[PDB]
Design a protein around this nucleic acid. Structure first.
Ligand SMILES: [Zn+2]
Ligand SMILES: [Zn+2]
Lengths: 50, 539, 522, 128
DNA sequence: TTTTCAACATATATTAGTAATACTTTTTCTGAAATGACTCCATGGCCAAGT
DNA sequence: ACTTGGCCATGGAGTCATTTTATCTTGTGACAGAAAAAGTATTACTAATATATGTTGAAAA
């Protein structure tokens, strides 16, 4: 959730997010916009993917 | 959900959903799956197939494809580009699965030639004959009669001899026999535009109708080359009688079967509006003329050339006279007592022809007893729809639909007057009719930019639609039904192999009767449909 | 609710320190859920009527500056009130009126039913009707007890004056308190004693205000005001202790409401006296009230107002009635003897003059009875105690009413000791109920008794047997004065000439409408 | 008429008459009763009511007023739509000989289903 | 004249009979920028009859 | 054969319309009119009451 009060967490904007691309870090994104924010296991079906 | 109304198999598959069962059910596995791809995606080339089917290239495609060609379920056209090499390409043979889909009815073709020997070994004989001729492909009396026993009377064992001609039965099929009719029109489109004595660029009209006429008139003998050719029929060798050419492979003609079965539906329509005597008369009245008339045969080029809002009239009026004058000479003029049981003096009894009035026959050359067709047959077909929406929605529906027939684009305010019933019914028997389409809708904006309520609504017919999606009947149980035949098989699938080598248990005998009555339903049910199918798809 | 998947303890605590907000057990310290997911940021006859009732309801609400809050409680009563279809065929106003009033009573607030009414045309009676009516249907008893301490407040604000009134308030209430223990308080519109005590302390506070401007807030009568004032004038230490320093005497002395005091002016053991009995009779044959109206001493036929004939007799001081259908009501009966006896005498006119007029369907519908216990009564605790069967409605009538189930009879209650009984078809059930609730009377007292036998006098069927029950026995019980009770032919003619003479306007629209019946064809 | 019902009542009446008007009366008892080739010359007979019906309408036996020749046709057209009868040569008319329905191979009546249990049927819905 | 009484009447909730009329509620039932298209016009060219 | 008119198709062109225009903040905030159903209110009764209201008025002060 957002800002002070409610509880923590901060913003990575597309304006900022690009930054790490220039450095070239893949693993920092996958840690960042993947593991550390919403890590989630979806069960899909190879045949007729859904 | 619940699978009983079967949605998965139930909608997104029209048209093709028929075939992909037929070739599946009637051939199976790899043999099927090709045609599904073909019809779906249209034109296709040998190598290009396996780009999709995942069918183990140049194995099945070779095997399955030529296998189909022997049964002529595919259309086959090859040429080379101007760049080089050469290439083939394939289509699904016209209907052609038409043959399979009919089958035992094409067996019922016996009933016409059923005369001479009636319900004899001869019946069973010719039965075995034709039912084999469809099963294999083109046949030769030489190689089939060779497979048939020798050392018995060959023109007799195989007694269907001069009878090989009739209307139906066989024609030598070669080359131009099955090619896309369109593309053969495009090929004959050479020699005319491609051959011009380099005259002038001026007036494409001289380049066109001339070429078209040449295209047309050359096209005629192209279809008449298979029509009849004496070098088949005429052969009368020594110590023998007049025979076909036993050498060439000949194949079942579809259209004279088409023609003949159409005659039956006319016998049904007339079998209403006239008397059983006059009916039966008319029933043998076609039997002399049932040969010639095209029915589905003449429109022909109507598929495969752009019409012209001028020239298409030159096509239709051509159809207006086509059977009337010269084929009229082949048609009823003076005919006497074909079979018959009315008795004693038969002549004024023949004068009953004038009793036929509506909405068919009832014309002639001035006073010779004759029935026009080239006008009649076309001006007839447009009537045939009729019922097929009586038990469907209830009879109260017809009259208003039927009302929408005569007058047109007519508002329900004056429908309420013209037809007769309260609002409570008309609202349903109309709305119930509109979801099933037919009637469609017109509207006009009334003091509106484009609005619903303030506008006013009108109706119409536009019969092309109403006729058309009655071909849901195609996908309807000619598909779903036939599948309800298939999924049944797996129950006794373990039994099927047993009953094959049997000719045990009480409950096995019980489900025998079960699956058997089941079947006898499913196919007779089919024939019930197909009889209702023959109208729409063609004519 | 859940259990630790390990410690199997049920005690869970959500730690708010570090801005996790995890849920954990105090037992093994395992977490239940981390990541505390939180949220953030048709066509009915009933919707129309209901939400329309929140409209009309909320309307009358802030007019009275009641809490908007209470509206929602009242509304849902209206909801439940619709469930019994009690709300259908009455005036919408009277319905929602009581629907709100019952609420603001349940909260013990200051709004008096009189004030609530004057928003309308209404008589503070039709509302008094509907309110007391839904008391039956929706089953409610104990809650609505109105008391003085509330009314003085809402009064006090509107009374102008100055901050002194607060003292006066503190003054007046203690006053009104003793008057309640002075045992004059019951049987009175609480507004009356409210404005009364207000005027009292105001005078005691030496400020001069009229009687009018008082009832301006009080909504009682001037005379009504000063009357109970005089009722205070004669009380114990009334003018004796009336001096200053806010008399601290809480000792009441006697309790003597001006109720049996009137009986003092007029002058189990005592059996309740019967009063009136009413029954029904069927002749079996329909008649003509026009023709029956011809010869009688006692008749009134006035179809313009009410369709019937009014009959009665001087002796044995009975009335009865007649219908058009050939039936009649039995009234004026102080006993069962005079009931069927005279009842047959009514058929002596008809069977003497009119049609067959048999005697059928004789059944007492109700019996009136009354008694007096000759001692004061406390109603406020009675309904506070027996309220399940005891409904003391607020100041919407002097007496307390009691609904007895066993057997089912209504009794009315006066602090004088006068106790009325009706709603009974049986004389025995009367005294059964009387000796039954007499221990409730004697039960509530502060500081005769011999029932003798539960049944003394002969039964009702004894007196019914004292009269000939055969519909064909008439001339035997005929007074022969009914031969005199018939007027002569001229009295009929000229009398009917006057009657018809003034009723031909009723007959005008009557037969004119009969012609309109022909007009109905077109 | 009046907008509401009791019309088809007299409809079946006129259909009785015109049904007679075609060949001799019903003769549906046994197999061949029709017309025996319409008396003589099953050509010469061109028959209908038009004007004539109101002479037959004279029968009444029903509470109502008269009816105009225009409204007659307005009735007969409905039966043209229901195919109870046919329209030949303007105000002349025929019957569709569906006295036979009064009573593959095709007609609505004279047909009844199983329509219980067995899962193999043909509907016109469930394509939709 | 005022205040007293007081008296005098009159609703006032109870209970059924009615029966009849009237009267309301309820419950249905329908009368800034910049590309996308869009039309509106103008020429090319083709087909034809008089020349 | 050789020029014109008309004609239909196509190319421009001046016509109208859809979606962007930055983060991190950090509080904050359903129609009416009508029908019919259904139901109750009256209008006669006694009738025991005890307030209320009034008016008036009569009699006392
Ligand atoms: Zn899947
Ligand atoms: Zn735990």
């Amino acid at each position: 959730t957002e800002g002070r009060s409610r509880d923590g967490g901060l913003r990575l904007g597309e304006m900022e997010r690009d930054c790490v691309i220039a450095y070239g870090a893949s693993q920092l994104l996958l840690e960042r916009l993947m593991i550390s924010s919403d890590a989630f296991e979806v069960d899909v079906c190879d045949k007729c993917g859904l | 959900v619940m699978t009983i109304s079967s949605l998965e198999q139930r909608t997104l598959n029209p048209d093709l959903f028929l075939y992909k069962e037929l070739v599946k059910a009637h051939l199976g596995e790899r043999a099927a799956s090709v045609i599904g791809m073909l019809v779906a995606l249209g034109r296709l080339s040998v190598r290009e197939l396996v780009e999709k089917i995942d069918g183990m290239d140049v194995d099945s495609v070779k095997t399955t494809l030529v296998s189909l060609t022997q049964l002529r379920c595919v259309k086959y056209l090859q040429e080379t580009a101007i760049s080089g090499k050469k290439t083939t390409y394939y289509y699904y043979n016209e209907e052609g699965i038409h043959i399979l889909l009919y089958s035992g009815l094409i067996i019922d073709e016996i009933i016409t030639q059923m005369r001479v020997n009636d319900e004899e070994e001869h019946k069973q004989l010719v039965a075995e004959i034709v039912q084999n001729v469809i099963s294999l492909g083109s046949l030769t009396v030489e190689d089939y009669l060779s497979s048939v026993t020798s050392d018995s009377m060959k023109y007799t064992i195989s007694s269907l001899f001069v009878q090989l001609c009739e209307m139906g039965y066989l024609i030598q099929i070669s080359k131009l026999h099955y090619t896309p009719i369109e593309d053969l029109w495009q090929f004959l489109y050479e020699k005319h535009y491609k051959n011009i004595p380099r005259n002038s660029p001026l007036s494409d009209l001289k380049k066109r109708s001339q070429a078209k006429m040449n295209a047309k008139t050359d096209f005629a003998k192209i279809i008449n080359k298979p029509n009849e050719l004496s070098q088949i029929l005429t052969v009368d060798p020594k110590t023998s009688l007049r025979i076909v050419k036993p050498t060439v492979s000949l194949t079942i003609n579809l259209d004279r079967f088409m023609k003949g079965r159409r005659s039956k539906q006319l016998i049904n329509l007339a079998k209403t509006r006239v008397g059983s005597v006059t009916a039966q008369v008319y029933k043998i009245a076609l039997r002399l003329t049932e040969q010639k008339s095209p029915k589905i045969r003449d429109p022909l080029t109507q598929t495969g050339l752009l019409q012209d809002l001028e020239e298409a009239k030159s096509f239709q009026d051509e159809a207006e006279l086509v059977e009337e004058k010269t084929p009229g000479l082949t048609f009823n003029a003076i005919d006497l007592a074909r079979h018959l049981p009315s008795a004693s003096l038969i002549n004024s009894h023949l004068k009953i022809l004038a009793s036929s009035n509506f909405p068919f026959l009832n014309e002639t050359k001035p006073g010779v007893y004759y029935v026009p067709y080239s006008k009649l047959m076309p001006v007839l077909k447009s009537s045939v729809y009729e019922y097929v929406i009586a038990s469907t929605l209830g009879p109260s529906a017809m009259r208003l639909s039927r009302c929408i027939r005569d007058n047109k684009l007519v508002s329900e305010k004056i429908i309420n007057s013209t037809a007769l019933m309260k609002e409570k019914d008309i609202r349903s028997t109309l709305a119930s009719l509109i979801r099933y389409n037919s009637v469609e809708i017109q509207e006009v904006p009334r003091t509106a930019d484009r609005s619903a309520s303030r506008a006013v609504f009108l109706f119409r017919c536009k019969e092309t639609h109403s006729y058309n999606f009655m071909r849901q009947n195609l996908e309807w149980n000619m598909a779903n039904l036939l599948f309800k035949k298939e999924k049944l098989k797996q129950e006794n699938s373990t039994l099927l192999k047993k009953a094959n080598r049997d000719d045990l248990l009480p409950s096995e005998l019980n489900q025998l009767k079960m699956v058997n009555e089941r079947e006898l339903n499913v196919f007779a049910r089919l024939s019930r449909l197909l009889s209702l199918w023959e109208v729409f798809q063609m004519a | 609710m859940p259990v630790c998947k390990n410690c199997h303890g049920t005690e869970f605590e959500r730690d708010l320190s570090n801005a996790n907000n995890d849920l954990v057990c105090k037992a093994c310290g395992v977490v239940s859920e981390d990541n505390p997911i939180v949220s953030e940021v048709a066509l009915e006859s009933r919707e129309a009527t209901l939400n329309n009732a929140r409209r009309k309801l909320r309307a009358v609400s802030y007019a009275l500056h009641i809490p908007e809050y209470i509206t929602d409680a009242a509304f849902q009563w209206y909801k439940l009130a619709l469930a019994n279809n009690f709300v259908q065929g009455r005036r919408s106003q009277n319905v929602i009126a009581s629907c709100l009033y019952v609420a603001c009573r349940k909260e013990k607030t200051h709004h008096m039913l009189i004030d609530f009414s004057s928003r309308l045309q209404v008589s503070v009676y039709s509302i008094g009707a509907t309110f007391l009516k839904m008391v039956k249907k929706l089953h409610i008893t104990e809650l609505p007890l109105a008391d003085p301490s509330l009314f003085i407040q809402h009064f006090a604000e509107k009374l102008d004056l100055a901050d002194k009134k607060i003292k006066v308030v503190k003054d007046a209430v203690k006053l009104a308190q003793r008057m309640s223990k002075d045992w004059m308080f019951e049987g009175r519109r609480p507004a009356g004693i409210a404005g009364a005590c207000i005027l009292l302390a105001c005078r005691m506070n030496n400020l001069r205000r009229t009687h009018t401007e008082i009832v301006a807030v009080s909504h009682v009568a001037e005379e009504t005001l000063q009357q109970r004032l005089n009722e205070f004038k004669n009380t114990k230490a009334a003018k004796l202790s009336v001096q200053k320093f806010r008399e601290n005497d809480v000792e009441d002395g006697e309790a003597r409401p001006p109720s049996f005091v009137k009986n003092r002016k007029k002058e189990s053991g005592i059996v309740p006296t019967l009063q009136n009995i009413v029954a029904t009779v069927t002749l079996g044959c329909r008649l003509d009230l026009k023709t029956v109206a011809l010869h009688a001493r006692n008749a009134e036929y006035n179809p313009k107002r009410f369709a019937a004939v009014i009959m009665r007799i001087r002796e044995p001081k009975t009335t009865a009635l007649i219908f058009a259908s050939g039936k009649m009501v039995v009234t004026g009966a102080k006993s069962e003897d005079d009931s069927k006896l005279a009842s047959r005498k009514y058929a002596r006119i008809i069977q003497k003059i009119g049609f067959a007029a048999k005697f059928t369907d004789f059944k007492i519908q109700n019996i009136v009875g009354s008694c007096d216990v000759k001692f004061p009564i406390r109603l406020e605790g009675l309904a506070f105690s027996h309220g399940t069967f005891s409904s003391y409605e607020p100041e919407l009538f002097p007496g307390l009413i009691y609904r007895m189930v066993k057997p089912k009879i209504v009794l009315l209650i006066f602090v004088s000791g006068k106790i009325v009984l009706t709603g009974a078809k049986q004389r025995e059930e009367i005294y059964q109920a009387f000796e039954a609730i007499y221990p409730v009377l004697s039960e509530f007292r502060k500081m005769s008794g011999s029932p003798r036998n539960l049944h003394l006098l002969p039964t009702t069927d004894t007196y019914l047997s004292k009269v000939s029950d055969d519909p064909d026995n008439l001339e035997d019980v005929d007074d022969e004065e009914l031969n005199a009770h018939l007027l002569n032919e001229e009295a009929s003619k000229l009398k009917e000439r006057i009657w018809i003479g003034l009723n031909a306007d009723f007959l005008l629209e009557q037969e004119s409408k009969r012609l309109k019946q022909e007009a109905d064809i077109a | 008429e009046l907008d509401i019902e009791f019309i088809n009542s007299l409809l079946t009446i006129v259909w009785r008459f015109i049904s007679e008007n075609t060949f001799p009366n019903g003769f549906k008892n046994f197999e061949n009763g029709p017309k025996k080739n319409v008396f003589y010359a099953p050509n010469v007979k061109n028959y209908s009511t038009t004007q004539e019906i109101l002479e037959f309408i004279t029968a009444a036996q029903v509470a109502n007023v008269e009816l105009t020749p225009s409204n007659i046709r307005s009735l007969c057209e409905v039966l043209v739509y229901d195919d109870k009868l046919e329209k030949v040569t303007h105000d002349c008319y025929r019957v569709t000989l569906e006295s036979i329905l009064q009573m593959s191979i095709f007609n609505y009546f004279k047909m009844f289903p199983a329509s219980k249990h067995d899962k193999e049927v043909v509907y016109f819905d469930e394509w939709t």
